[PDB]
Amino acid sequence: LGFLGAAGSTMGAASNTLTVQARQLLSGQLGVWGFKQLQTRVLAIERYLEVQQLLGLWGCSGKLICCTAVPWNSSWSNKSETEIWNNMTWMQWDREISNYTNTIYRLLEESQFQQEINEKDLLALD
Partner 1 sequence: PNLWVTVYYGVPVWREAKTTLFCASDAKAYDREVHNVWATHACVPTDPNPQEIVLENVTENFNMWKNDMVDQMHEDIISLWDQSLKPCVKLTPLCVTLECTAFNSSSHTNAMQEMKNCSFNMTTELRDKKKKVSALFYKLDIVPLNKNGRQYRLINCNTSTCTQICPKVSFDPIPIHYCTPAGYAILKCNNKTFNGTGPCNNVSTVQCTHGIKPVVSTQLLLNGSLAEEDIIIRSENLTNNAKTIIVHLNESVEIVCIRPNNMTRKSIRIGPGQTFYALNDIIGDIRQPHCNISKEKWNNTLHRVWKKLVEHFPNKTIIFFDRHSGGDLEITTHSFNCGGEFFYCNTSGLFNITYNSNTKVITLPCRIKQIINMWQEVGRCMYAPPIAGNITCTSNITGLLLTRDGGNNSTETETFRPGGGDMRDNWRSELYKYKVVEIKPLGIAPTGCKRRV
Ligand X SMILES: *[C@@H]1O[C@H](CO)[C@@H](O[C@@H]2O[C@H](CO)[C@@H](O)[C@H](O)[C@H]2NC(C)=O)[C@H](O)[C@H]1NC(C)=O
Ligand Y SMILES: *[C@@H]1O[C@H](CO)[C@@H](O)[C@H](O)[C@H]1NC(C)=O
Asked if residue 8 binds ligand Y (CB under 6 A), the reply is yes
Nearer to ligand Y, 53 or 87 (CB): 87
Asked if residue 8 binds ligand X (CB under 6 A), the reply is yes
The CA distances from residue 15 to 20, 68, 75, 112, in Å, are 11, 17, 24, 23
Distance (Å, whole) CA 20 – CA 3: 5
CB proximity list for 107: less than 8 A, separation 6 or greater = 70
Distance (Å, whole) CA 32 – CA 47: 22
Lay out the site mask for a second copy across 96-125 (x = CB under 8 A, - = otherwise): -------------xx--x--xx--x--xx-
Lay out the site mask for ligand Y across 42-81 (x = CB under 6 A, - = otherwise): -----------------------------x-x-x------
CA dihedral 86, 48, 105, 11 (to 10 degrees): 0
The CA distances from residue 46 to 26, 51, 69, in Å, are 11, 9, 28
Contacting residues toward a second copy, per CB under 8 A = 15-16, 18-19, 22-23, 25-26, 28-30, 32, 34-36, 38-39, 41-42, 45-46, 48-50, 53, 55-57, 59, 61-65, 67, 109-110, 113, 116-117, 120, 123-124
Contacting residues toward ligand X, per CB under 6 A = 8-9, 73, 75
